[PDB]
Design a protein around this ligand. Structure first.
Ligand SMILES: [Mg+2]
Ligand SMILES: [Mg+2]
Ligand SMILES: [Mg+2]
Ligand SMILES: [Mg+2]
Ligand SMILES: [Mg+2]
Ligand SMILES: [Mg+2]
Ligand SMILES: [Mg+2]
Ligand SMILES: [Mg+2]
Ligand SMILES: [Mg+2]
Ligand SMILES: [Mg+2]
Ligand SMILES: [Mg+2]
Ligand SMILES: [Mg+2]
Ligand SMILES: [Mg+2]
Ligand SMILES: [Mg+2]
Ligand SMILES: [Mg+2]
Ligand SMILES: [Mg+2]
Ligand SMILES: [Mg+2]
Ligand SMILES: [Mg+2]
Ligand SMILES: [Mg+2]
Ligand SMILES: [Mg+2]
Ligand SMILES: [Mg+2]
Ligand SMILES: [Mg+2]
Ligand SMILES: [Mg+2]
Ligand SMILES: [Mg+2]
Ligand SMILES: [Mg+2]
Ligand SMILES: [Mg+2]
Ligand SMILES: [Mg+2]
Ligand SMILES: [Mg+2]
Ligand SMILES: [Mg+2]
Ligand SMILES: [Mg+2]
Ligand SMILES: [Mg+2]
Ligand SMILES: [Mg+2]
Ligand SMILES: [Mg+2]
Ligand SMILES: [Mg+2]
Ligand SMILES: [Mg+2]
Ligand SMILES: [Mg+2]
Ligand SMILES: [Mg+2]
Ligand SMILES: [Mg+2]
Ligand SMILES: [Mg+2]
Ligand SMILES: [Mg+2]
Ligand SMILES: [Mg+2]
Ligand SMILES: [Mg+2]
Ligand SMILES: [Mg+2]
Ligand SMILES: [Mg+2]
Ligand SMILES: [Mg+2]
Ligand SMILES: [Mg+2]
Ligand SMILES: [Mg+2]
Ligand SMILES: [Mg+2]
Ligand SMILES: [Mg+2]
Ligand SMILES: [Mg+2]
Ligand SMILES: [Mg+2]
Ligand SMILES: [Mg+2]
Ligand SMILES: [Mg+2]
Ligand SMILES: [Mg+2]
Ligand SMILES: [Mg+2]
Ligand SMILES: [Mg+2]
Ligand SMILES: [Mg+2]
Ligand SMILES: [Mg+2]
Ligand SMILES: [Mg+2]
Ligand SMILES: [Mg+2]
Ligand SMILES: [Mg+2]
Ligand SMILES: [Mg+2]
Ligand SMILES: [Mg+2]
Ligand SMILES: [Mg+2]
Ligand SMILES: [Mg+2]
Ligand SMILES: [Mg+2]
Ligand SMILES: [Mg+2]
Ligand SMILES: [Mg+2]
Lengths: 82, 157, 129, 121, 205, 80
RNA sequence: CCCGCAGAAGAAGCACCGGCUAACUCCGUGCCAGCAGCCGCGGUAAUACGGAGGGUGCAAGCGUUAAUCGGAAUUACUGGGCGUAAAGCGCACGCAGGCGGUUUGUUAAGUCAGAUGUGAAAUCCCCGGGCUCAACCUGGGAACUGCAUCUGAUACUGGCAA
RNA sequence: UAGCUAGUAGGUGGGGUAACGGCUCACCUAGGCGACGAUCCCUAGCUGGUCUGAGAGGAUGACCAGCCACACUGGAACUGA
C-alpha cells in the first residue's frame, strides 16, 4: 500500500516534515517514490509555512493511495477555496 | 622607476693553497611595474657590495614584456637548464600565487595576478631566467595581428 | 616507416622555418591541401601550389615577418598512435585564442574558431601558435 | 612511456611501506617490557641511551626509547608505546609514553610537561 | 575566547597604534611605542617574507579582536563571495556588531563595545543581540536599550567619537543613542594603511 | 526498430547454437587510446544455417539454456 | 525565552623561541645528563640540553601519536625519462597484437550534431529563508561530468569494392 | 596460479518451477570457457557519497539514504501473497 506521509527531518526540537509518497513497509525517513511538498510546524506567521503540490496528489490518491492522519489535515489546511 | 628587490643571497667557496676564501653571490630583479624586467646576478667578497654589483647589472640587462592590463596574455612555458616553469594569465581578481624567486620577478614586472608553478629544479638563478625566457617569448594580440597581416578583431573575436 | 604523413608535413614546416627556408616541397594529398589551405587562409603560410599530375608535389611558401619566423610552434595532437576527438564545448583554444587548432569536422576541415560558431566538434589535428 | 605499453601494463603505484609496524593504524599500544638497558648511539653522539625491549600485546617484539631524565621501568612493568624514531640508536623506532600506566612522569620538570607526563606544580 | 592580557603590549610589537587602549585620552606617549616589544626590543628584526605576512594578519586580528579559528573562517567566506578576496576579508570584519558599536561611538574601546554588546545593552531592529560576531546586514538600525541608556560609560565614550574620523557608511543620532548602518563599507573609506594582499597570501599557501 | 547487434562468428559446432564475437571499439578510460575489445555471446539458430567466419545479426530475447540468451535474426555476408 | 537581585565576584591554560618557522638573554651541566620532524645540538662562555626570566603562536583548548591525500611532474593520461646519473634485450627472424602510402566509391562501426528518457532523495555548488549569531536546519535553482535509444553530418579513423 | 571443465556444452522427449531455463532427468551429439586472463590463491559487502586535489586523479565507503548478505554453528522443509 502506497501512502502519503511525513518524513521528519530537521534538528533536535526543531522539526521539519517532508511530506512524501512512500510504501507502507518502507521506513519513515527511508525509501520513497517521490516527495510532494513539505510542512513546517515551527514556521509561524511569515513568508513561508506549508506547501503541498496538489497535482501529484491526484496521480496517487486517484489511483489508490491512503493519506496519513496529519497529511489529511494539511489538505484541509491548504483548502480548495480558502 | 626602481621597484628593485633581492631574491637570494648565497655564499660560495674557492679553495687555495692556504685554506678557502668565501665570496657571496646575490640575485636581484628590477622592474618599472609596467612590462619591464631585468635580473642581475652579481658576486663579491662582501655581502652588501655583491647586491650593488648585482643591482647595476639588473638595470642594464632589461627585457620588455607586452602584458594585458595587469596580467599575462596567454599560458606560457619557459624552460631553462633544470627549471620548467609554467604560468597562466588568470582573471582580474586574485593575486600573484607563485613561488619565491618566481614571484619577485613577476611582481616587479607589473603582473598583479597570475597562476604559476615551477616544475623540475627550483634553483633561484635558473627559475628567474626561466620566467624571463617565458615573459620575453610571451607575444601579444597586437604583435600576432601584424605578424600574419590579417586583422586585430578577426583574430581576437 | 611513414605512418603519419600529416605530422611529417608539420615537421617540414617547423624545420623549414628554423632553417630560414623560402619554400617546402612534399608529397601531396587530400588532407594535406585541406590543412595547408587553412594555414594560408588565416595567414601562417604565404601562398601554395599543387604542381604534378601523376606524382603530385605540394610545395608551400613560408612567411617571415621580422628575422623571426611566423609559425612560432606547431605540433601534432591527434597522432595515429592516439586519436583525439573533442566535443563542441570541449574544443581547445591555443594560446588563449590567438593561435589556432586545426580541427577535422564533419563539414570539412576548419579552424577551432569556425567550429564553435558552426556548432560542431571533431578530430583536432594540430595546434598552431 | 608509449600509450599502448601503458594499456598493456598500467602504472604500478609505489606502495610505500610504513615506518612503524604497530599494525591496524593504531595510535599507541601496550607492552609488557623485558630487558631495560643502556646502549651507545652512532658516530657524532656518544652517550648511554636508556631503552627497553617491549613484548607488545599483538605479538611483536620491539625496542622503545625511554625519554626524559630517569625512569621507573625495570624487568617487567606494563608501559605504553607511541611511534617515533630516535635517529641515533639504529633499530630503535618507538617511544615510551611517559605518564601512561607503570611508566611514571619525569621528576622535577616545568617546561614542556605534556611530553614527559608531569602534572602542574 | 578573548585576549584579556596586556593590551598596549600588542601595539608595540606591531609598531602602529591598534586602537586597543584608545580610550578617553587621545594620544598615549606612555609606553615607549615602536622601540620596545619586550625585553629584547632594541633588536632590529631581519623580518622574512612569511614574517611580514604574519605581522599583517596578527595586526588586523588584534585591532578587530578576533581569533585565528574565527578569522580563518572569514577568509573561507571571503573566497567564496564575489569581487576581490582581499576587499571581502575586511568588509566582513567591519560588518561585526562589536565593530559597528565601536564605530558608532558607544564605547571608548572595541573591547568596551564588545562587553556592551554581550551584556544585553545593544539592540538592533527591535531585537536584543549578545553576539559580537553578529554580521550586521545592510540597512539596519542598531541602538541601546532604555534600561542601560545614558549610563556613565556611554556618555563619556560618545564625546570621544567627535575627535575620531567618523565613517561615511554609517550614521549616528547622538541624542537618543540610536544608530543607522546604511551600506557596506568601501576599501578606500577606512584604514588606508593595513594591507589586505599580505593576509590573502598567508592563507592561500 | 528491434535492438539488433552485428558480429562475426567464432564457431558453430554445437548443433542448433552458435558462438559470436562482437567487436566493440571503445576507448580506454585513463589513457584515451581506442582499444579493439571483444564480447563472445552464445546465440540460438534453427539448423546449421551459419558457418565459421561470417557476419551475423543478433537479438536479445528469452533465456533458452545456461548461457545463450541471445537469438539469431538473419545472415548478412556469408563465409568466404 | 523574559524579566529580579548580588557582586568582579565562580570562570586560563600549553606548545614552542638554532635553520626550515613567528620569538632571546642568564645561570646549571661539560660528547655526561639529555634533545631530535629533517639538517643536526652537548668535549667548561650552549640561543638547540635542564631551570629561570623574557618572548612568540594558538586559546577551552593545546600539543604528541596513528591514519589519507597534497606538496611528489618521486608511476608523469593531462605531465617524466633511458650516451655518461636508475634505465636499449648480445644480435636477428617472426605468428597473435599495435600502427600503416595514395585516389575513387560506398556504408555509418568509431567520431560529431541534435532530440527524448533516465542519472533515487540527501550530499556538493549559487540565490534565498529560519533558529538572538554561527554551526545546524531548510525553499528553489544549477548540477548529477553519465548511460540508453532515436534522427541526422561524412572531414577524419574503420569495414568493404576497384 | 596456464589450462580448466562431464550435467560439463547443446538437442529431442518426459517430469518440475508462479514463471523460462541442465532447474532436473533419460537418451543423442563433443562441445564450452581460455592470453581482451579461464582455473586456482589472497583480500573485500556494493553504491549515492566522504575526505583530498587546480583538475585529472588518489584514497575511502563510520553517521544519513538505496541494494545485497547473514541471525549460536551445519542442514532441511512446513506455513504463507
Ligand atoms: Mg526491501
Ligand atoms: Mg502550528
Ligand atoms: Mg698555486
Ligand atoms: Mg628534484
Ligand atoms: Mg553530450
Ligand atoms: Mg658511541
Ligand atoms: Mg571555541
Ligand atoms: Mg587592565
Ligand atoms: Mg592553495
Ligand atoms: Mg537504429
Ligand atoms: Mg544501437
Ligand atoms: Mg537571562
Ligand atoms: Mg544586578
Ligand atoms: Mg560593583
Ligand atoms: Mg551595588
Ligand atoms: Mg582571575
Ligand atoms: Mg662523562
Ligand atoms: Mg663553548
Ligand atoms: Mg651559557
Ligand atoms: Mg630550551
Ligand atoms: Mg612563558
Ligand atoms: Mg587535537
Ligand atoms: Mg602522499
Ligand atoms: Mg602524483
Ligand atoms: Mg607520458
Ligand atoms: Mg625523472
Ligand atoms: Mg656508473
Ligand atoms: Mg647507468
Ligand atoms: Mg639494445
Ligand atoms: Mg645494442
Ligand atoms: Mg625484455
Ligand atoms: Mg603482423
Ligand atoms: Mg590495419
Ligand atoms: Mg590511411
Ligand atoms: Mg591516406
Ligand atoms: Mg547513408
Ligand atoms: Mg556511428
Ligand atoms: Mg558511440
Ligand atoms: Mg550523441
Ligand atoms: Mg540526486
Ligand atoms: Mg544558505
Ligand atoms: Mg536568520
Ligand atoms: Mg541570517
Ligand atoms: Mg551544512
Ligand atoms: Mg537546502
Ligand atoms: Mg532540492
Ligand atoms: Mg535538469
Ligand atoms: Mg559524400
Ligand atoms: Mg568517403
Ligand atoms: Mg573510408
Ligand atoms: Mg507465490
Ligand atoms: Mg539460467
Ligand atoms: Mg574540494
Ligand atoms: Mg582544493
Ligand atoms: Mg597535483
Ligand atoms: Mg571501493
Ligand atoms: Mg556501524
Ligand atoms: Mg547513532
Ligand atoms: Mg539508522
Ligand atoms: Mg534486489
Ligand atoms: Mg537478487
Ligand atoms: Mg541462511
Ligand atoms: Mg535471509
Ligand atoms: Mg542474532
Ligand atoms: Mg532463526
Ligand atoms: Mg536456523
Ligand atoms: Mg542456520
Ligand atoms: Mg489466508
Amino acid at each position: 500500500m502506497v501512502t502519503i506521509r511525513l518524513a521528519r527531518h530537521g534538528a533536535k526540537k526543531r522539526p521539519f516534515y517532508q511530506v512524501v509518497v512512500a510504501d507502507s513497509r518502507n521506513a519513515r525517513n527511508g525509501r520513497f517514490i517521490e516527495r510532494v511538498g513539505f510542512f513546517n510546524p515551527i514556521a509561524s506567521e511569515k513568508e513561508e509555512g506549508t506547501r503541498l503540490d496538489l497535482d501529484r496528489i491526484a496521480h496517487w490518491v486517484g489511483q489508490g493511495a491512503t493519506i496519513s492522519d496529519r497529511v489529511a489535515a494539511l489538505i484541509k489546511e491548504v483548502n480548495k477555496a480558502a | 622607476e626602481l621597484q628593485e628587490k633581492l631574491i637570494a643571497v648565497n655564499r660560495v667557496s674557492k679553495t687555495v693553497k692556504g685554506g678557502r676564501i668565501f665570496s657571496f653571490t646575490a640575485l636581484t630583479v628590477v622592474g618599472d611595474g609596467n612590462g619591464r624586467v631585468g635580473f642581475g646576478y652579481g658576486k663579491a667578497r662582501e655581502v652588501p657590495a655583491a647586491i650593488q654589483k648585482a643591482m647595476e647589472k639588473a638595470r642594464r640587462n632589461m627585457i620588455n614584456v607586452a602584458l594585458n592590463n595587469g596580467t599575462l596574455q596567454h599560458p606560457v612555458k619557459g624552460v631553462h637548464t633544470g627549471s620548467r616553469v609554467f604560468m597562466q594569465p588568470a582573471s582580474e581578481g586574485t593575486g600573484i600565487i607563485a613561488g619565491g624567486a618566481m614571484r619577485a620577478v613577476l611582481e616587479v614586472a607589473g603582473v598583479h595576478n597570475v597562476l604559476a608553478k615551477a616544475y623540475g629544479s627550483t634553483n633561484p638563478i635558473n627559475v628567474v631566467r626561466a620566467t624571463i625566457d617565458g615573459l620575453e617569448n610571451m607575444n601579444s594580440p597586437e604583435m600576432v595581428a601584424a605578424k600574419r597581416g590579417k586583422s586585430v578583431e578577426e583574430i581576437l573575436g | 616507416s611513414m605512418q603519419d604523413p600529416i605530422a611529417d608535413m608539420l615537421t617540414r614546416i617547423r624545420n623549414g622555418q628554423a632553417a630560414n627556408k623560402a619554400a617546402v616541397t612534399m608529397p601531396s594529398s587530400k588532407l594535406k591541401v585541406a590543412i595547408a589551405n587553412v594555414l594560408k587562409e588565416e595567414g601562417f603560410i604565404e601562398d601554395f601550389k599543387v604542381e604534378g599530375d601523376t606524382k603530385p608535389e605540394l610545395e608551400l611558401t613560408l612567411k617571415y615577418f621580422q628575422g623571426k619566423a611566423v609559425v612560432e610552434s606547431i605540433q601534432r595532437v591527434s597522432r595515429p598512435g592516439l586519436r583525439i576527438y573533442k566535443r563542441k564545448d570541449e574544443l581547445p583554444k591555443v594560446m588563449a585564442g590567438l593561435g589556432i587548432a586545426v580541427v577535422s569536422t564533419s563539414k570539412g576541415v576548419m579552424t577551432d574558431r569556425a567550429a564553435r560558431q558552426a556548432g560542431l566538434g571533431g578530430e583536432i589535428i594540430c595546434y598552431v601558435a | 612511456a608509449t600509450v599502448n605499453q601503458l594499456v598493456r601494463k598500467p602504472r604500478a603505484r609505489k606502495v610505500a611501506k610504513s615506518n612503524v609496524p604497530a599494525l591496524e593504524a593504531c595510535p599507541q599500544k601496550r607492552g609488557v617490557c623485558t630487558r631495560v638497558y643502556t646502549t651507545t648511539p652512532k658516530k657524532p653522539n656518544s652517550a648511554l641511551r636508556k631503552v627497553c625491549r617491549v613484548r607488545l600485546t599483538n605479538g611483536f617484539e620491539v625496542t622503545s626509547y625511554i625519554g626524559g631524565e630517569g625512569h621507573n621501568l625495570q624487568e617487567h612493568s606494563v608501559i605504553l608505546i607511541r611511534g617515533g624514531r630516535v635517529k641515533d640508536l639504529p633499530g630503535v623506532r618507538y617511544h615510551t609514553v611517559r605518564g601512561a600506566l607503570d611508566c611514571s612522569g619525569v621528576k622535577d620538570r616545568k617546561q614542556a610537561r605534556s611530553k614527559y607526563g608531569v602534572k602542574r606544580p | 575566547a578573548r585576549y584579556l592580557g596586556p593590551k598596549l603590549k600588542l601595539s608595540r610589537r606591531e609598531g602602529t597604534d591598534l586602537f586597543l587602549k584608545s580610550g578617553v585620552r587621545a594620544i598615549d606617549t606612555k609606553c615607549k611605542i615602536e622601540q620596545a616589544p619586550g625585553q629584547h626590543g632594541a633588536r632590529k628584526p631581519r623580518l622574512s617574507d612569511y614574517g611580514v605576512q604574519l605581522r599583517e594578519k596578527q595586526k588586523v586580528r588584534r585591532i578587530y579582536g578576533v581569533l585565528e579559528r574565527q578569522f580563518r573562517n572569514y577568509y573561507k567566506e571571503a573566497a567564496r563571495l564575489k569581487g576581490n578576496t582581499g576587499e571581502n576579508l575586511l568588509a566582513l570584519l567591519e560588518g561585526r556588531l562589536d565593530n559597528v558599536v565601536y564605530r558608532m561611538g558607544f564605547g571608548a574601546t572595541r573591547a568596551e563595545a564588545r562587553q556592551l554588546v554581550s551584556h544585553k545593552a545593544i539592540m538592533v531592529n527591535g531585537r536584543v543581540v549578545n553576539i559580537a560576531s553578529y554580521q550586521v546586514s545592510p540597512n539596519d538600525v542598531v541602538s541601546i536599550r532604555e534600561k542601560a541608556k545614558k549610563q556613565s560609560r556611554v556618555k563619556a565614550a560618545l564625546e570621544l567619537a567627535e575627535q575620531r574620523e567618523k565613517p561615511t557608511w554609517l550614521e549616528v543620532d547622538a541624542g537618543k543613542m540610536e544608530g543607522t548602518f546604511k551600506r557596506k563599507p568601501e576599501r578606500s573609506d577606512l584604514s588606508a594603511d593595513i594591507n589586505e594582499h599580505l593576509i590573502v597570501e598567508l592563507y592561500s599557501k | 526498430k528491434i535492438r539488433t547487434l552485428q558480429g562475426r562468428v567464432v564457431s558453430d559446432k554445437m548443433e542448433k547454437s552458435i558462438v559470436v564475437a562482437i567487436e566493440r571499439f571503445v576507448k580506454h578510460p585513463i589513457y584515451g587510446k581506442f582499444i579493439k575489445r571483444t564480447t563472445k555471446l552464445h546465440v540460438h539458430d534453427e539448423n546449421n544455417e551459419c558457418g565459421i567466419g561470417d557476419v551475423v545479426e543478433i537479438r536479445e530475447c528469452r533465456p533458452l539454456s545456461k548461457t545463450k540468451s541471445w537469438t539469431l535474426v538473419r545472415v548478412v555476408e556469408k563465409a568466404v
